[PDB]
Design an enzyme around this catalytic site. Sequence first.
Site, short mmCIF file in Angstrom:
data_model
loop_
_atom_site.label_atom_id
_atom_site.label_comp_id
_atom_site.label_asym_id
_atom_site.label_seq_id
_atom_site.Cartn_x
_atom_site.Cartn_y
_atom_site.Cartn_z
N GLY A 1 2.50 2.59 -2.45
CA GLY A 1 2.42 3.30 -3.71
C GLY A 1 3.26 2.78 -4.84
N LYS A 2 3.55 1.48 -4.84
CA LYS A 2 4.35 0.86 -5.89
C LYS A 2 3.65 0.80 -7.27
CE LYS A 2 4.67 -2.95 -3.50
NZ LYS A 2 4.02 -2.44 -2.28
N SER A 3 2.42 0.29 -7.28
CA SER A 3 1.68 0.17 -8.54
C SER A 3 1.34 1.54 -9.14
CB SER A 3 0.43 -0.66 -8.30
OG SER A 3 0.81 -2.02 -8.17
N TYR A 4 0.98 2.49 -8.29
CA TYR A 4 0.68 3.85 -8.75
C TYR A 4 1.90 4.43 -9.48
CZ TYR A 4 -0.80 8.69 -8.91
OH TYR A 4 -1.14 9.95 -9.35
N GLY B 1 0.76 -1.25 0.00
CA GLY B 1 0.00 0.00 0.00
C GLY B 1 0.79 1.30 0.00
N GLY C 1 4.45 -6.51 -1.75
CA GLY C 1 4.70 -5.74 -0.55
C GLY C 1 5.80 -6.32 0.32
N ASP D 1 7.28 -4.33 -10.73
CA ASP D 1 6.39 -3.87 -9.68
C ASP D 1 6.31 -5.00 -8.66
OD1 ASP D 1 4.48 -2.66 -8.12
OD2 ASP D 1 2.79 -3.10 -9.45
N1 LIG Z 1 1.97 9.75 -5.48
C1 LIG Z 1 0.68 9.51 -5.24
N2 LIG Z 1 -0.25 10.52 -5.36
C2 LIG Z 1 -1.58 10.32 -5.13
N3 LIG Z 1 -2.01 9.10 -4.77
C3 LIG Z 1 -1.14 8.02 -4.62
C4 LIG Z 1 0.22 8.24 -4.88
N4 LIG Z 1 0.82 7.06 -4.67
C5 LIG Z 1 -0.10 6.18 -4.32
N5 LIG Z 1 -1.32 6.77 -4.30
C6 LIG Z 1 -2.59 6.07 -3.91
O1 LIG Z 1 -2.35 5.27 -2.72
C7 LIG Z 1 -3.11 4.06 -2.78
C8 LIG Z 1 -2.20 2.83 -2.63
O2 LIG Z 1 -1.24 2.85 -3.71
P1 LIG Z 1 -0.98 1.55 -4.60
O3 LIG Z 1 -2.18 0.74 -4.75
O4 LIG Z 1 -0.38 1.88 -5.90
O5 LIG Z 1 0.08 0.80 -3.68
P2 LIG Z 1 0.89 -0.54 -3.78
O6 LIG Z 1 1.05 -0.97 -5.18
O7 LIG Z 1 2.20 -0.28 -3.06
C9 LIG Z 1 -0.10 -1.82 -2.99
P3 LIG Z 1 0.45 -3.56 -2.95
O8 LIG Z 1 1.70 -3.69 -2.14
O9 LIG Z 1 -0.66 -4.38 -2.40
O10 LIG Z 1 0.79 -4.00 -4.45
C10 LIG Z 1 -3.89 4.09 -4.11
O11 LIG Z 1 -5.24 4.47 -3.86
C11 LIG Z 1 -3.11 5.09 -4.97
O12 LIG Z 1 -3.90 5.68 -6.02
MG LIG Z 2 0.59 -2.68 -6.27
#
Ligand SMILES: Nc1ncnc2c1ncn2[C@@H]1O[C@H](COP(=O)(O)OP(=O)(O)CP(=O)(O)O)[C@@H](O)[C@H]1O
Ligand SMILES: [Mg+2]
Lengths: 328, 427, 440
Positions: free
Chosen positions: A100-103, A98, A249, A246
Site C-alpha cells: 500500500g505504498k503508492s495508495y 503490494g 517493494g 514512494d
Molecule cells: N488504505 C487502503 N484502503 C483501501 N485500499 C488500499 C489501501 N491501501 C492500499 N489499498 C489497495 O491495495 C492495493 C495495493 O496497493 P498499492 O498498489 O498502492 O501498493 P504498493 O504501492 O505498495 C505496490 P508496489 O510495491 O509494487 O509499488 C491497491 O489495489 C490499492 O488501491
Molecule cells: Mg506502488
Amino acid sequence: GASVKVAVRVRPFNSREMSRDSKCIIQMSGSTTTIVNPKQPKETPKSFSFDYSYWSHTSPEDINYASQKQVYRDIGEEMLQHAFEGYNVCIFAYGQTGAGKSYTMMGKQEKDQQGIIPQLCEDLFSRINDTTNDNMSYSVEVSYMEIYCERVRDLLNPKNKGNLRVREHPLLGPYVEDLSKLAVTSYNDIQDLMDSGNKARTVAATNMNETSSRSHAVFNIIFTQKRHDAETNITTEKVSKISLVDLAGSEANINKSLTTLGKVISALAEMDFIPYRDSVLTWLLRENLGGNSRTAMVAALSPADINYDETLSTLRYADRAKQIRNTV
Amino acid sequence: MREIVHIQAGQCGNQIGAKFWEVISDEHGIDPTGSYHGDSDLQLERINVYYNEAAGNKYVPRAILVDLEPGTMDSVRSGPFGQIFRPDNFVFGQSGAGNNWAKGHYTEGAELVDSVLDVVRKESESCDCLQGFQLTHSLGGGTGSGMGTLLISKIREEYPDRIMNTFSVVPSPKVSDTVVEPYNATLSVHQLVENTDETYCIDNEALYDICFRTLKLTTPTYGDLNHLVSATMSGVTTCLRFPGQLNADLRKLAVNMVPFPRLHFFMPGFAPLTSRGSQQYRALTVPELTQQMFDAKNMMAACDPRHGRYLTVAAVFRGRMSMKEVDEQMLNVQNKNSSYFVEWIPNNVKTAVCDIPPRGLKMSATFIGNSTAIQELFKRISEQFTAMFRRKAFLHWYTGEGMDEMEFTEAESNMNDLVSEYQQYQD
Amino acid sequence: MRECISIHVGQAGVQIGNACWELYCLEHGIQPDGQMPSDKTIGGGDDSFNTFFSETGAGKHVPRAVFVDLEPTVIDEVRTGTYRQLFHPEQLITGKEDAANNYARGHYTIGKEIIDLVLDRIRKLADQCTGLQGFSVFHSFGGGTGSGFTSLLMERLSVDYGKKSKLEFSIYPAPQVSTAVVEPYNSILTTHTTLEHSDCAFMVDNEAIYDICRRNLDIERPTYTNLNRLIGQIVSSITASLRFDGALNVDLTEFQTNLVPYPRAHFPLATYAPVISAEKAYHEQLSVAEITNACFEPANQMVKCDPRHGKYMACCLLYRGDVVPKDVNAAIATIKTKRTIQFVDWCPTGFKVGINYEPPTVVPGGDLAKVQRAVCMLSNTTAIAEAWARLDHKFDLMYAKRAFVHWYVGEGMEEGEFSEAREDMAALEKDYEEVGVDSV
Ligand SMILES: Nc1ncnc2c1ncn2[C@@H]1O[C@H](COP(=O)(O)OP(=O)(O)CP(=O)(O)O)[C@@H](O)[C@H]1O
Ligand SMILES: [Mg+2]
Ligand SMILES: CC(=O)O[C@@]12CO[C@@H]1C[C@H](O)[C@@]1(C)C(=O)[C@H](O)C3=C(C)[C@@H](OC(=O)[C@H](O)[C@@H](NC(=O)OC(C)(C)C)c4ccccc4)C[C@@](O)([C@@H](OC(=O)c4ccccc4)[C@H]21)C3(C)C
Ligand SMILES: Nc1nc2c(ncn2[C@@H]2O[C@H](COP(=O)(O)OP(=O)(O)OP(=O)(O)O)[C@@H](O)[C@H]2O)c(=O)[nH]1
Ligand SMILES: Nc1nc2c(ncn2[C@@H]2O[C@H](COP(=O)(O)OP(=O)(O)O)[C@@H](O)[C@H]2O)c(=O)[nH]1
C-alpha cells in the site's frame, strides 16, 4: 535533534490474499501494532509502538478506518507547516510489494482517495493563495524522478533517454545532473505534471505490466518564500525542499538502493560510518536521513497471514527508523 | 529392490562422485544385485542394455549427475573411470558456476533444477522400488549448497515416502569461501526441514586427522580423501544392501538415527583405517573395530563427539565375523561412555552385519550416530553467521541472486534453535 | 566456458598484454583452452582455410583478445614487424586520434568517437562462443586512454553487461611516477570504475614491482619490459589457473565475491610468492607453504600498500603447481596464527584458496625460477585505504587546490569530473576506513 516520525498502516485484503483465504494477523490499538505468527501460534504476539498505527483494514464506513484525509492531516500537514517555517522535509513510504505504498503517497483521483502528495500540493497552493500580506511573494518549482536499478530517469521529461548522472557538488551536496525543475503557479498545473509523470514510470511484464515493483519515485518541490519590506529594500529568502518518496517493494544492480537504505537506517539507529554513497537513493537522500531535515516514514503493511515474514521485517525496520534523530 | 537414485552435485558432490562410485565396479552399486559374486569386468560398464537400470549393478552406471560449472564434466568424463554414462550428465552450459546458495539454488539451478527433474524421473521409473536418494553436497557450494537444497526440496516434496540420504561436506576451522558461514547455513534450513532424512557429515578439516593419524599418507590429497568417504557410503549403501545376517535397509537408517523430526545429522567412521605398513596390527579386529568406531580420533567428521552424548548410535560391521561377536562387543562401548548415552534411549546402539568384507580389507566397520555434540558443528557456523553474513552483512553477492533479508534470518533462527533444541537433550 | 574477454586500454595495457599474451604461450587462452597442438606463433598449428581473425580456429588457436590503442605506438609493436607474435589481426584498435593524456581526453574527446567501434568489436567478440564470464581491462592511473577511456570503456561495458563483472588491472601511481597529471587524474579514472561498474580490480604498483625486484629478485637496473612480467604473471594465476582444470577452482565469479566485501569497487592486491632468482638456490626448492607467507610478506607485495595499516579484508590465494592440500589447509592456518594479518572484524576464515595446474609457467632469464609452487594473494586490506589518500593529498593540491585543469577542461566537463571525483572517491577514504575501524 528531531526524531524521524514513524507511522505504519495496514490495508484491506487484496485479491491474492483473498484467493488464498488469508486470515488477518495484524491488530492495532492506540499507537501500538501487534502481529501474530500464523505458523507458530504458540508464541506470544510481537507488539510495536509508533507515532501512529493506522487501521485501514476495513472501509470508510467503519468509524475506526484511517482515511487518506487522516493520514495527510497528521503527518502531511505537519511537514508542510515545517516547510513554511523554512525547514527541509521528507516523507517516504516503505513496505513489501503490494502493501500500500503508492495508495498512501499518490492514492487515486476520485472519491477523496487522493494520497499525501496530491493533498499536500493542494494544501500548499491554497495557503499561498490565502496570503493577504502583499510583502510576501512565492515561487514553487517541481521535479519528479524515478530510480530503477540505480538508473535515474526524469519523469517530467520522458523525452530524453539519458540516464541522468547523480553527482556530488563540491560544496552543495548531491544532485541529479540536468534533472528538469519546472515552475508551477497553480495546483492544477502541478497535478498535471504529476499525472504525466505517473504515466512515465517503468512497468514490468512480471507485475502483469503494471508499474515495476522495483522502481523508486521521488517527487520534489522547491518552495521559495520572498519577504519584502519597504525600508532598506532587501527581500529576504527562505527556501525549503520538500521530498516525497514512494519506494520500491522491500521484498548498477536491482535491489541496491533498498538494501542500502536498510543498512543506513540500521546504522543511524545504532549510532544514536554510514554507507550513504553505496546507492543512488541513500546518496540523494543523505540529508533527509540523519541530516538537516524533518523526516517521516510511513510503513505499509499487508494484513495477511501469508506475508508474516515480510510484514515483521517492515515493522522491525520501522521500529529502528523511529530511533533516528536528524540534526536540524 | 531397494533400488537407487543417484544425484551428484557441485564440486564436492561430483568429485566425491568420482570416489564413491569407483569403489563400486567393486560391484554392488545401488540396487541391482548380482554381479559382484564371481568377479569380473570393469569400468564404466559390461554387457547389456542401456540405460539407466543397469544402474549401479551390471551393464550400466546409474547415476544422476549434477555439475553446475563444467567441472565435473571434464574432470571425470573422459579419460577417467567412466563413461559415466551419457544421458545422466548435467553440464550447466556455463551458468558460470556460482558461489552462493541463492545462486544455482534460486538462479541457474532453478532452470537446471528443473532439468534435474528429468533425471530423477527416469531413474525413479527403473522398474525397481527405489529407497534411496543419494546426494553429494557442499557447505559453501553455492551450486551444491543452494542447488543441493533445491534438488532436495523437490525430491522431499514429490518423494515424501523415500527418505533422502544426503552426504554432506561442512565447515571446519579452516575454510573455503568466506561466505561459507552463512552459505551452508542457508543450505541448512533446507537440510533439516527439506526432506533430507539423514545427513552425513564429512568435514574436510576432520578428514585429515584420519588420513593422517590413523593413516600415515605422507601428503594427503583431495583424491585420497575420496578413498575415506567411499568407506562411509559403502557401509550404508552397499552394506545391508549387499547380502546379510541382520540387515538394515536404508530406512532403518532413518529410524535408527533420527529420534525425532528435525534433520538428524550424523557423524560416521570407517575403521580399518590401517597404515600401509602398520598393516600388521589386529587382524581386522572387532574390538578393534569397535574401538575405532568411537574414539574421538577416528570419526570422519568435524565434531569431536566426546563433548557430549550421542543420541542414537548406528554401527555396521561387514567382515564375516560373529553375529555374537559384534553385538557382544558394542556393549562395552556403551558402558564407558555413559555420559555418552543419552539416558533416554535404550538401545543406544544398533548394529548391522552384512556378509562380504570390503574387497580387500577382509573385515569392516561402519559407524553412524548423533550425539549432543553437534550443538557444536553448528554453534560454530552460527556464531559465524550472526557475526558474518547477518552481521554487518555479506550478501550483496547473494542479494542479486534473489534472497532479501530472508534466507539468512530464517536460517539462523531455525538452524539456531537447532542448537537449543538439540541441547535440550542432555543439559 | 566461461570465457574472459580481454580488453586493453593503454600503453600500460597494450604491453601488459604482451606480458599476458606471451605468458599464455603454453597452449592456453582466455577461456577456451580447450586445447591446441600449436605452439609458437601459432603458424605451425596449421591454416585451415580462413582470413583475418579465424573461423577455422577457436580463441584457443587464436585468442580472447581486444587491444585499444589511442596511439599506434604500443599497438604498432604488437603489430610491430609481426613482432614475433602474430596474435591476430583485427583484435587490435589503433586510433590515430592522436593520443591524449587526460582523463578528459580520449575519455570525453577522441575516445568517445572510437569507443563505439570498439564496443562493436567487443560485442561481436562477446558473441562468438559461449560463456564469457569475464572482462579484463588493463588500466592505468594516468593514461588518457586509461582514465576517461576506461571510465568510458568500463562504464559502457558495465552499463551494457551488468551481469558480467569486469575485472580490470591497474598500474597506479605511488611515490614515483610519470606525468604531473597522474596525482589527480587517475582520481578521475577512479571515480568512473566505481559505480559505473567494475568488479574486482587488481594492480601492479610500479613502485612496488621495481621494489620487489630489488628486495626479492635481483636486477636493480631493470626495464619496465621486465616489470611487466611481474604483473604479467599475476594474471596467469588469476585467469590461466582458475581457467584451467584442477582442484578447488575459483572462476571469475569467485573473484568478485571473495574480494568484494562491500560495494564501492574494490580493490585488491597481488602477491606472487615464487620470484626466485636466476641467481637463487632456493633451498633446492622453495618450501611450498612458505610460499603462503611469501604472500603476506609485505615484500612480494606489488604495491606500496603498507599492510602495516589495518586489517586485511578479503584474502584470495591461488596456488598452482605441485601444491599439497595439506599445504594449504595447514599453511593457511598458520597465517591466521600470526598477530599480523589482523583480519578484519567480519572475515570468516578469510582465506580463499585455489589450486591450479600445471606448474608455474616461465620463459627466459628475466622470468625467474622454475618454481614449482605458487602463491597469489589477492587481498583487500585497509591499506588501499591510504594509497588513495596519497592521491587525494595530491589532488586536493594538484588539480583542485590551485587547478591544473586547463588542459583537461579543453577536452570536456569542469567542476565535477573533478569535484565529484574527489568527493565520491573521497568518502571512499572515509567509508573504506570505517569498513575496518571498529567492532560494530
Ligand atoms: N488504505 C487502503 N484502503 C483501501 N485500499 C488500499 C489501501 N491501501 C492500499 N489499498 C489497495 O491495495 C492495493 C495495493 O496497493 P498499492 O498498489 O498502492 O501498493 P504498493 O504501492 O505498495 C505496490 P508496489 O510495491 O509494487 O509499488 C491497491 O489495489 C490499492 O488501491
Ligand atoms: Mg506502488
Ligand atoms: C580404503 C582403504 O582401506 O585404504 C587403505 C589406505 O588406508 C586404508 C586401509 C587398508 O587396509 C589399505 C591401506 C589396504 O591395505 C587394503 O588391503 C586394501 C584395501 C582393502 C583396498 O581397499 C579395498 O579393496 C576396499 O575394497 C576399499 N576399496 C577402495 O578404497 O577402493 C578405492 C578404489 C577407493 C581405492 C573399500 C573399502 C570399503 C568399502 C569398499 C571398498 C585399498 C588399498 O589400496 C589401501 O588404500 C590405499 O592405499 C590408499 C591410499 C591413498 C588413498 C586411498 C587408499 C587400503 C588396499 C588394496 C591395499
Ligand atoms: N609497469 C608498467 N607500467 C607501465 C607500462 N606501460 C606504461 N606504464 C605506466 O603507465 C603510465 C602511463 O603510461 P603512458 O604510456 O604515459 O600512458 P599512455 O597510454 O601513453 O597515456 P595517454 O597518452 O594519455 O594515452 C606510466 O606511469 C607508466 O609508468 C608497462 O608496460 N609496465
Ligand atoms: N572432500 C572434498 N571436498 C571438496 C572437493 N572440492 C571441493 N571441496 C571442498 O568443499 C568446499 C566447496 O567446494 P565445492 O564443492 O566446489 O563448492 P561448490 O560447488 O561451490 O558448492 C571447498 O571449500 C572445499 O573445501 C572435493 O573434491 N572433495
